[PDB]
Curated annotation (Swiss-Prot), chains A, B:
Transmembrane spans: none
Designated name of the protein: Flagellar hook protein FlgE
Signal peptide region: none
Stated family: Belongs to the flagella basal body rod proteins family.
Protein's cellular compartments: Bacterial flagellum basal body
């Protein structure tokens, strides 16, 4: 469970495609940490694109 | 009887042949002592490699 506040005045991203490598194809990137049954962790990145 | 708690995130050692002199040939080394008929103490080393 994660919350976000946003700005209504954010322009549309310029990068028409999307790639995790770039830093423009998305409005903003966050991440979350999760665990498996064996204990070792994983990280999920989330990208907001207007 | 000895309980050891191994780790999931232990990377594979580097030195492919097993050597007790190079610490990078095994993931972990543990020791124990046993006794004989004479009464002298003998130490065993057990080496864990993933």
């Amino acid at each position: 469970s994660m919350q976000i506040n946003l700005n209504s005045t954010d322009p549309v991203p310029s990068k028409t495609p999307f790639s995790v490598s770039d830093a423009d194809s998305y409005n903003k990137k966050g991440t979350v940490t999760v665990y498996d049954s064996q204990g070792n962790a994983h990280d999920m990145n989330v990208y907001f694109v207007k």
